[PDB]
Amino acid sequence: MKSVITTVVSAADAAGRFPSNSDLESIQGNIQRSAARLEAAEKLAGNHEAVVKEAGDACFAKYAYLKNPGEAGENQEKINKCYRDVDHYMRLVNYCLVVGGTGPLDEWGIAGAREVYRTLNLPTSAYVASIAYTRDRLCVPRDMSAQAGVEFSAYLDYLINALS
Amino acid sequence: MKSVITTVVSAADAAGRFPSNSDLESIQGNIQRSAARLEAAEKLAGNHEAVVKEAGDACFAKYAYLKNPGEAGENQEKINKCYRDVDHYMRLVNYCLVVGGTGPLDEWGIAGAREVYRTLNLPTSAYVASIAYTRDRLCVPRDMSAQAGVEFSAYLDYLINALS
Amino acid sequence: MKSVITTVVSAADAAGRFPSNSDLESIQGNIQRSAARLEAAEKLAGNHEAVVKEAGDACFAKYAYLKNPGEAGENQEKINKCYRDVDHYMRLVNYCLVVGGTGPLDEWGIAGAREVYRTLNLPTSAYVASIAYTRDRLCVPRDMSAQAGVEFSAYLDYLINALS
Amino acid sequence: MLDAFSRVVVNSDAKAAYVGGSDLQALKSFIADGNKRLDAVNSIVSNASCMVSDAVSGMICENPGLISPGGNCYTNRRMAACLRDGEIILRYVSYALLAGDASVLEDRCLNGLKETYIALGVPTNSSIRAVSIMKAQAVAFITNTATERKMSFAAGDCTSLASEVASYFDRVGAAIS
Amino acid sequence: MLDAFSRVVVNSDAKAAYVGGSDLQALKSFIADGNKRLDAVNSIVSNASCMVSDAVSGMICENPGLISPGGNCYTNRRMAACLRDGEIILRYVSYALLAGDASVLEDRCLNGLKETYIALGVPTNSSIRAVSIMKAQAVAFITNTATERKMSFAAGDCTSLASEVASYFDRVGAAIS
Amino acid sequence: MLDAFSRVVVNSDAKAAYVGGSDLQALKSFIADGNKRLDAVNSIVSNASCMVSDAVSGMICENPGLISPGGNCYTNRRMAACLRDGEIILRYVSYALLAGDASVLEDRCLNGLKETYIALGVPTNSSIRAVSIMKAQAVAFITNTATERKMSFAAGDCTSLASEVASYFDRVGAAIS
Amino acid sequence: WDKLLNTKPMKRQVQPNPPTNETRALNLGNTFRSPAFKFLGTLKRSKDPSGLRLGFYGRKADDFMARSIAMQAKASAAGSGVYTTQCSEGASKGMAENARTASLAKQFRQAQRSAREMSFDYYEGRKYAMKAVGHICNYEEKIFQQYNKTAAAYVMGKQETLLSCDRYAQPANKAEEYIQKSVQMQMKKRSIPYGVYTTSCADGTVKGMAENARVAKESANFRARQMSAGAKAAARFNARRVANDWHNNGCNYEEKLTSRFPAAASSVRPTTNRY
Amino acid sequence: LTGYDSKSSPNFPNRAATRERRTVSFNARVARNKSQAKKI
C-alpha cells in the first residue's frame, strides 16, 4: 500500500521508535482536504460507464491501425476486452482519491506493466495516450469543485509518468 | 533532523521515486496548525529567564541532598552550571515547536544522554523530574491558546519518555 | 595548386631524392581521409541550388542597406551578380573537398580577391556574413556523417580568415 | 534532511539563540506560501517524464557528437543509463523546491558528482546543456507559459518561487563544472 | 627540428643505446591522442583571424599608451606592423603543438627576439601582455569553453593536451623580452 | 624572486585585476600536495655528498679525455673546482623545490654561465652528460626507486612532482649550448 | 520607401493573419571548464582516478574509522564476550589462512573493480547507508555520504549483528526453502547479468581453495540450525526488519511474503555487493 | 589577416642555413643583426 499511514507508522517501526509528533502531524493534512479529495471520487463513480466509451474510440481514432488481423485489435472480442482494460485502470485511480496516495495503483496496476503489454503485442503508446486523452479532459469550476481536479489530474499524468 | 520533510522527501529518495501526492499531502497539516504551533514558541521565549529559576529549586526542593561535598551540587558553581543545563533542554523544545517534529531534540540533546550523566555522577532521576515539574506546569485557556499547549505538553513528557 | 600531393613531390624535387618511405604516409594519410571526405562533396551537390540562396538571403537578412540607391545590391541585375558571386565561392568548396588541399581557393577565389572588392565598393564581411549561415546550419549526423561535418566546416574556417 | 524550518534554527544554534519573532516573519512568509509552493511542485511532477524526454532529446539536437560511434553516449544501454542520470537530478531538485532549501541537493548527489563523470568519461559540457533545458522548461510549468499544457490554478505572482528554482540547477551546474 | 618522437631519440642517442621497452608507454601515449591532437591543431588555425585581432584590441583598450601620439602603434605603419608582429608567434606555436614538442620554438624565433624588440623600440610591458590574452583564449577553444562560439566535437578530457598550446609560449613569453 | 604563489599574482597587475574566485581553488591545488613535496625535499639534501661527486665520477670513466692532458678534469686545481662548480646546481634545485617557482633559478645561475664557459674551454655536450646522471638520482628519493639505499616515507604516489625537479634540469641544457 | 522623423514604433497594423510567416532565432552552444593561468613550472591536465579522490588525507582517514565501525560492530557481535557462531570463516580443517586468501582476494578483486562498478557502488552504498540507519541525523549520514567504506562497513557491519543475512535463518518446511532458493537465483542473475561470469563471485584462486569454499558453507549451513533456539527465533522477526522497511516499500504482496516467509526473505540480499 | 600570408621577415636573427661555408661568410651569416642587438 501507499499512503501517509505507510510513511510514518512504518518509519517509526523502521527507527524502532514511538509514534512521536512528527508522525501525528502528517495525517492532519488528510483531514483538512479529504473534503477536497472526496467529491472527485463520486464523479468517476457517476461516470464509470460514461467516460470509458468516450476514451476508447478517442484512442482508436488516433490509433486506428489495430483492426487488421495479427494485431492487438483484430476483432470486437479484443475491443470487448479493451473497454475492460481502460476501466481497470480507471477503477484504481478512483481508489487513490480515497487512500490519499497512489496505494492501489503501484502494487496492483503499475509495477511490471512494462513486462506484459508488447509481450502480448499490446501497444504501450496507445495506453498512455488513451489516458492522456482523459488527462486534459476536465473543466475545474464546472464538472467538480476547484479543490477536486488537482488530485484527479495529478494522478492521470502520473500514469504516463509511471509507465516511463 | 526530524520533521515531515525528513519523512516524505527521504522516503521518496529511499524508494528512488518522485514526490508524488502522498508526499505533497503530508505537509498540508503543517499549514493549518502552524498558527496553533507558533504562539507557543514566544511564550517560552518570553519566559526564557522566568521559568528556568522556578524549575531549579522546585527540583532542588525534592532533590535537596545535592549540597554535600562529593556530589553533583556541592557548590554554587555547580548550580551556576545547573541553570545552564535545564535551559539547554529548554532551548531545544522551543525549536521543536518550529520544525514540527522533535528535530533539534534527538540529534543534539537526547541521543546518548544515557551515556553521560551518572558517569559524570549527575542524577538522571532529577533530570526527568525537573522536566516533569514543568510538564504539568501549564494552564491551557489562560497562559496560551487552547491550540498551543498540546504541542508543548506532548514534548515535555516525551523528554521523560526519551530518557526511558 | 596547394594539395596533399603537391607538398610531397615539390619537396622531393627540392631534396633531389626519390620518394622515400617517409613521403608516402601522407598518401596513407590521404586514403584514410578520402573515404569519409567525398561523402561531404556529393551531398553538397544535391542541395546547392537552394543553399546558395538560403545562405545568400541571410546577408540580406543581416545588412538591409545594400538595397538602397547608390549601393551594390540596388537592383535585380546587380542582385543576381550577388548570387553569381556566392555560387562561385561554394563551387570552389567542393573542388577543395576533392583535392584535399586549398589550391582552387587560393588561385581562383582568394588570390586577388580583396583588391577588387575595395575598388568595386563591395563589403568584405558581407560574404563571411553569408557563409557563417552555412556553418551553423549543420546538424552533423543528418546532413553529413559524424566526422565529415568537421572536415567540411574546416574549409569554412579558411575563407572567413581570408576576407577577415 | 534539512529545510527552511531548520535553516532558520541552525545558525541560531551556533550562537545558542532562542528563536523569537524577529525572524519568524521570514517563516510567516514561508507559511504564507504553503499552497503557493504546493501549486508549484505539483506542476513539476505532473509532466516530468516529458521533461526528461525533452531535455536529452534537445541536448542531442544541439550535439550529435555523442550518438556518433566511439562517442560517450551512443548505444542502447548507454541511453538507458543516460535516461537514468537524466531523471535523478530532476527528482532531487523537486525535493529542494519542496524544502525551500537546497541542503538535500548537496549531500545526496553533489559530493563528488562532477568527476565521477570523468572517472566514467562523461562530458561535463553536455551535462550543463541538458540541465539548462531542464531549467528552462521548469519555469514554464510553475508559470503557465507552456506550449499546450495549461494547468488549473488561481492567479497571482509566482516569481519568488521561480527565482528559487533559478537558484537550484545552477548550484548543480556549478557543482558539475 | 625535433617532434615528440624525436625527443626520445637524442637522449637515447646520448645514452648510446637503443629505443627499448622503457619508452613504449610514451610512444603508445602519443599514438592514442592523435585523433584529438589533430582535432586540437585545427581549433587554433580556424579562429586565428579573430584571435590576433582580439589580442591587439584587448591590449590597446586597457593600455592607451599604445595610442599615444608618436607611439608604438600610432601610425598606420606601426599599427599594421603589430597585427603581423604578434601573429607569427601565434603561427609558430601552431606547428609546435602539432609536433608535440617546442623544439622548433627556440631555434626559429626565440633565438633573438628578447634583444631584438628593444633593438628597434618595442618595449617589455605590452609584449608580455599580448601573449597572456592569447593564452587564456587558446585554452578556451580546445576545451570548448568559449563564450560566443561552441564547436561541435565528441566527448572527452582536454586538460592534458590543450596545455601544450600554453606551453608553446613559455617560449614566446620569457624571451619575448 | 617571484615564488610559486606570486607568478600568477603579477599577471593580475598586468590584467588590472584582483585575486578573486578564479584561481582560488588553483592556489590551494599547490597546497595539499605540499607536504607531499616537503617530504620529497630533504632526502636529496641528506645525500648532498654523492650527487655532486657522482656527477663527475660518471664523467671520468665515461669521458677518459677529461682526466687526460687537455681535458678539464686533469689538474687538482680543476678537480677541486670540478665540485666547486658542481655543488652550485645541487643546492639551487633544492632552492627551486622549496620555493616551487623557477623565476629566480634562470638568472642567478643561468644569466651569465654560457658566456664564461666559452672562455674557460668547456665541452658543453659533456657538461650536459655531467648533469643527466644528476637528473636520474633525484627520482630515487622522491619516488623511492633507490636500488642501493632506501629511506622510509609515507605510502602514496607523488608522481606529479616527478619531473618538475627535472623540468629545470633541461633549462640549463639549453642555456649552455 | 521614404523615411520620416515621426515616432510610430509602437503601432502595428492589424492585418496580422500572421500564421503565414513563422520565424525563429538562436544562441547557445558554449560550455566552459575553469583552466589554470600564469605560466612556467606548471601545466595540469584532468586525470581518471576511478575512486573517491577526496584527498589523500581523506582516503587514509576513511579506512580507519570503518575499521573502527567494524570493531564497533565486532563488539556488538561480542557484546557478551563470545565469538558468536553465526560468524564462521572456515571449514572443519583449519583453512582460514586459505580463507585469508579468499578474503584477501575479495580485498583485491574489490580493489581491481572497473570504473563503472567502482563508481556505482559508491552511490548505491550512500543511499543504502540511509537505509541502514533507522534514524535521521545531522551526524551519521554526514559521514556516510562523503565516505563510502564507512557506508560499506555499516551495511555489512550493522546487518551482520542482526540475523537477516544469508545461511543463518533456517526455513521450516520445503515450501520456505524453495522460494529461499528462487530469490537467490535472481541474486545470481544480478551478479551474473549476462553470459559473462563476473570477476567478483570468483571465491577462489587455487585448487585448494576451490573445494574449500564448498565445504566452508556446509559447516556454516549446519551452524544456523545448531546454535540456539531463541536467537534463531529472533532471526525470523529480524528478517522483516530489513525487508519490509527498506527493500519493498509500497508492495504489500512483497511485504506479506516476508511475514509469511522470513527465511525466504532473508537471502534476498538487495545490498548490491555483486555476490 | 595582414597580407596574403604571414612569413618570416628577413631582418631577424638566425635567418640562414650556415652549414659548411667559408670563414668570412660564417660569422657574417651567423650573427646577422648583432649591430644593435648587443651594442645598446
Ligand SMILES: C=CC1=C(C)[C@@H](Cc2[nH]c(/C=C3N=C(/C=C4/NC(=O)[C@H](C)[C@H]4CC)C(C)=C/3CCC(=O)O)c(CCC(=O)O)c2C)NC1=O
Ligand atoms: C471525470 C471525468 C468526466 C468528464 C470530463 C465528463 C465527460 C463529459 N463532459 C461533458 C461536458 C463538457 N463541458 C464543456 C464546457 C466547458 N465550458 C468551458 O468554459 C470549458 C472550456 C469547458 C470545460 C471542459 C465541454 C467542452 C465538455 C466536453 C464536450 C461535451 O459537452 O461532451 C459532457 C457532456 C454532458 C455534460 O455537460 O455534463 C460529458 C459526457 N464526465 C466525467 O465524469
Ligand SMILES: C=CC1=C(C)[C@@H](Cc2[nH]c(/C=C3N=C(/C=C4/NC(=O)[C@H](C)[C@H]4CC)C(C)=C/3CCC(=O)O)c(CCC(=O)O)c2C)NC1=O
Ligand atoms: C511556558 C510556561 C510558563 C508558565 C507556566 C508560566 C509560569 C507562571 N505562571 C503563572 C500563572 C499561574 N496562573 C494560575 C492560575 C490558574 N487559574 C486556573 O483556573 C488554573 C487552575 C490555573 C492555571 C495554572 C496559577 C495556579 C499559576 C502558577 C502560580 C503563580 O501564580 O505563580 C505565573 C505568575 C504570573 C502570571 O500570572 O502570569 C508565572 C510566573 N510562564 C511561562 O512562561
Ligand SMILES: C=CC1=C(C)[C@@H](Cc2[nH]c(/C=C3N=C(/C=C4\NC(=O)[C@H](C)[C@H]4CC)C(C)=C\3CCC(=O)O)c(CCC(=O)O)c2C)NC1=O
Ligand atoms: C486490473 C488490472 C488490469 C489492467 C491495468 C489491464 C491491463 C491488461 N490488459 C490485458 C489484456 C488486454 N488489454 C487490451 C486492451 C487494449 N489493447 C489495445 O491495444 C487498446 C489500446 C486497448 C483497448 C482500448 C486487449 C485487447 C487485451 C487482450 C490481449 C489479448 O488477449 O491478446 C492484460 C492481460 C490479462 C487480461 O487479459 O486481462 C492486462 C494485465 N487489465 C487488467 O485486468
Ligand SMILES: C=CC1=C(C)[C@@H](Cc2[nH]c(/C=C3N=C(/C=C4\NC(=O)[C@H](C)[C@H]4CC)C(C)=C\3CCC(=O)O)c(CCC(=O)O)c2C)NC1=O
Ligand atoms: C546543549 C545541550 C546540553 C544539555 C542537555 C545539558 C546536559 C549536560 N549537563 C552537563 C553538566 C552539568 N549539568 C548539571 C546540572 C544539574 N545537575 C544536577 O544534578 C541538577 C539536577 C542539575 C542542575 C539543575 C551540572 C551541575 C553539571 C556539571 C557537572 C560537573 O561538572 O561535575 C553536561 C556536560 C558538559 C557540560 O558541562 O555542559 C551536559 C551535556 N548541558 C548542555 O550543554
Ligand SMILES: C=CC1=C(C)[C@@H](Cc2[nH]c(/C=C3N=C(/C=C4\NC(=O)[C@H](C)[C@H]4CC)C(C)=C\3CCC(=O)O)c(CCC(=O)O)c2C)NC1=O
Ligand atoms: C572565379 C570566381 C569568381 C568570383 C568569386 C566572383 C567575384 C566577383 N564578383 C563580381 C561583381 C559583383 N559582386 C557583387 C556581389 C555582392 N555585392 C553585394 O551587395 C553583396 C555583398 C555581394 C553578393 C552577395 C555585385 C553587386 C557585383 C557587381 C559589381 C558592380 O555592380 O559594379 C566581379 C566583377 C565582375 C562581375 O561584375 O561579375 C567578380 C570577379 N566572380 C567570379 O568569376
Ligand SMILES: C=CC1=C(C)[C@@H](Cc2[nH]c(/C=C3N=C(/C=C4\NC(=O)[C@H](C)[C@H]4CC)C(C)=C\3CCC(=O)O)c(CCC(=O)O)c2C)NC1=O
Ligand atoms: C549538403 C548539406 C546540407 C545541409 C547543411 C542542410 C541545409 C538545409 N537544411 C534544410 C532544412 C532543414 N535543415 C534542418 C537542419 C538543422 N536545423 C537546425 O536547426 C540544426 C542546426 C540542423 C540539424 C538539426 C532543419 C530542422 C530543416 C527544416 C527547416 C529549417 O529549420 O530550416 C534544407 C532544405 C531542404 C532539406 O531539408 O534538405 C537545406 C538545403 N541540407 C543539406 O543538404
Ligand SMILES: C=CC1=C(C)[C@@H](Cc2[nH]c(/C=C3N=C(/C=C4\NC(=O)[C@H](C)[C@H]4CC)C(C)=C\3CCC(=O)O)c(CCC(=O)O)c2C)NC1=O
Ligand atoms: C532539435 C531538437 C529539439 C527538441 C527535441 C526540442 C526540445 C527543446 N525544448 C525546449 C524548450 C521547452 N521544452 C518544453 C517541454 C515541453 N513542452 C511541452 O508543452 C511538453 C509538456 C514538453 C515536451 C515533452 C518547455 C515547456 C520549454 C520552454 C519553452 C516552451 O514552452 O517551448 C528547448 C530549449 C531549452 C532552452 O530554452 O534552453 C529544446 C532544445 N526543441 C528542439 O529544438
Ligand SMILES: C=CC1=C(C)[C@@H](Cc2[nH]c(/C=C3N=C(/C=C4\NC(=O)[C@H](C)[C@H]4CC)C(C)=C\3CCC(=O)O)c(CCC(=O)O)c2C)NC1=O
Ligand atoms: C495537495 C495538493 C495541494 C495544492 C496543489 C495546493 C492547492 C492550492 N493552491 C492555491 C492557491 C494559489 N496557488 C498559487 C500559485 C500559482 N498559481 C499560479 O497561477 C502559478 C502557476 C503558481 C505559482 C507558483 C497562487 C498565485 C494562488 C492564489 C493565492 C490566493 O488566492 O490567495 C490554494 C488556495 C489557498 C491559498 O493559497 O490561498 C490551494 C488550496 N494546496 C494543496 O494542499
Ligand SMILES: C=CC1=C(C)[C@@H](Cc2[nH]c(/C=C3N=C(/C=C4\NC(=O)[C@H](C)[C@H]4CC)C(C)=C\3CCC(=O)O)c(CCC(=O)O)c2C)NC1=O
Ligand atoms: C621570426 C619571427 C619574426 C618576428 C617576431 C618579427 C620580428 C620583427 N618585428 C619587427 C617590428 C615591429 N614589431 C612591432 C610590434 C609591436 N609593438 C607593440 O607595441 C606590440 C607589443 C607589438 C605588436 C603586437 C612594431 C611596432 C615594429 C616596428 C614597426 C616600425 O619600425 O615602424 C621587425 C622589423 C621589420 C618590420 O617592421 O616589418 C622584425 C624583423 N619578424 C619575424 O620574422
Ligand SMILES: C=CC1=C(C)[C@@H](Cc2[nH]c(/C=C3N=C(/C=C4\NC(=O)[C@H](C)[C@H]4CC)C(C)=C\3CCC(=O)O)c(CCC(=O)O)c2C)NC1=O
Ligand atoms: C620540516 C620538515 C617537513 C617534512 C619532511 C614534511 C613531513 C611530512 N610529510 C607528510 C606527508 C606525505 N608526504 C608524502 C610524500 C612522499 N611519500 C613518498 O613515499 C615519496 C618519497 C614522497 C613524494 C611522493 C605523502 C604521499 C604524504 C601523505 C599525504 C597526506 O599527508 O595526506 C606530512 C603530513 C602527514 C604525515 O605526517 O604523513 C608531513 C608533516 N613536512 C615538514 O614540515
Ligand SMILES: C=CC1=C(C)[C@@H](Cc2[nH]c(/C=C3N=C(/C=C4\NC(=O)[C@H](C)[C@H]4CC)C(C)=C\3CCC(=O)O)c(CCC(=O)O)c2C)NC1=O
Ligand atoms: C566509529 C564511528 C561511529 C559513527 C559514525 C557513529 C555511527 C553509529 N551510531 C550508532 C548508534 C546509534 N545511532 C543512533 C542515531 C542517531 N541518534 C539520533 O538521535 C539521531 C537522530 C541519529 C543520528 C545521530 C542511535 C539512536 C544509536 C543507538 C541505538 C542504535 O544502535 O541504533 C552505531 C552502532 C554502534 C554504536 O552504538 O556506536 C554506529 C556505528 N557511531 C560510531 O561509533
Ligand SMILES: C=CC1=C(C)[C@@H](Cc2[nH]c(/C=C3N=C(/C=C4\NC(=O)[C@H](C)[C@H]4CC)C(C)=C\3CCC(=O)O)c(CCC(=O)O)c2C)NC1=O
Ligand atoms: C519472495 C521474495 C520477494 C521479495 C521481498 C520482493 C523484493 C524484490 N523485488 C524484485 C523485483 C521487482 N520487485 C517489484 C516490486 C515492486 N515494485 C513496485 O513498484 C512496487 C512498489 C513493488 C511491489 C508491487 C518489481 C516491479 C520488480 C521488477 C523490477 C525490478 O527489478 O525492480 C526483486 C529482484 C528479483 C525478483 O523479482 O525476485 C526482489 C528480491 N520480490 C520477491 O520475489
Ligand SMILES: CCC1=C(C)[C@@H](CC2=N/C(=C\c3[nH]c(C[C@@H]4NC(=O)C(C)=C4CC)c(C)c3CCC(=O)O)C(CCC(=O)O)=C2C)NC1=O
Ligand atoms: C583479513 C583476512 C584475514 C583473517 C581473518 C586472518 C585469517 C585468520 N583468522 C583467524 C581467526 C578468526 N576468525 C574470526 C571470525 C571473525 N573475525 C573477527 O575478528 C571476529 C570478532 C570474528 C567473529 C565473527 C575470529 C574470532 C578469529 C580468532 C582470532 C581473532 O581474530 O581474534 C586466524 C587464527 C586462529 C587460528 O590459529 O586457527 C587466522 C590466521 N588472516 C587474514 O589474512
Ligand SMILES: CCC1=C(C)[C@@H](CC2=N/C(=C\c3[nH]c(C[C@@H]4NC(=O)C(C)=C4CC)c(C)c3CCC(=O)O)C(CCC(=O)O)=C2C)NC1=O
Ligand atoms: C554450495 C557451496 C559451493 C560453492 C559456491 C561451489 C564452489 C565451487 N564452484 C565450482 C564451480 C563453479 N563455481 C562458480 C561460482 C559460483 N557458482 C555458481 O554456480 C555461480 C553462478 C557462481 C558465481 C556467482 C561457477 C560459475 C562454477 C562453474 C560451474 C560449472 O560450470 O560446472 C566447483 C567445482 C570445482 C571442480 O570440481 O571442478 C566448486 C567446488 N561449490 C560448492 O559446493
